[PDB]
Amino acid sequence: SAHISDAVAVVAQAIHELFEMEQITDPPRGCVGNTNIWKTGPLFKRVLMSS
């Protein structure tokens, strides 16, 4: 519970810091029919690590 609140807090800060960034494609809708990776996401990791 102590970590939950904090982790989510960090996630929120990371996201709000993230969307300051631009031109991001939505993740693939559903597993079915998509053999391709998602360009958006590595970046989310990069901001989130630098929160």
Partner: protein, 122 residues
Amino acid sequence: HPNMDIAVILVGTTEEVAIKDVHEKDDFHHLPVTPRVELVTMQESDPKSIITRICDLMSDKKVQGVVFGDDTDQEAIAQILDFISVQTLTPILGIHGGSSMIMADKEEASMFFQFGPSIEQQ
């Protein structure tokens, strides 16, 4: 009577067709235990699709080994398969594509064969 149950799968644009049949013709070879093979292909391969199909194939084939092959250039599929090895403890290997690509040193419990050159070897 006394034959092992085996399955092989091909995915992506490439088609095995007659070559697989030739291998079976080629495959009888010399041996006391005979391979029993069930072949299925999938136009599309997915983490949910791939995971689903092989187990579904488990229900009828009840195969003691699996070979996976792909037309794909995606690295992640092999890792999913490692997870599957961990999940079902049935040998799986792959001859081409993603299954072939280099992967994280196999967890000892997991059983798995892929045609990928080792970093050290390279």
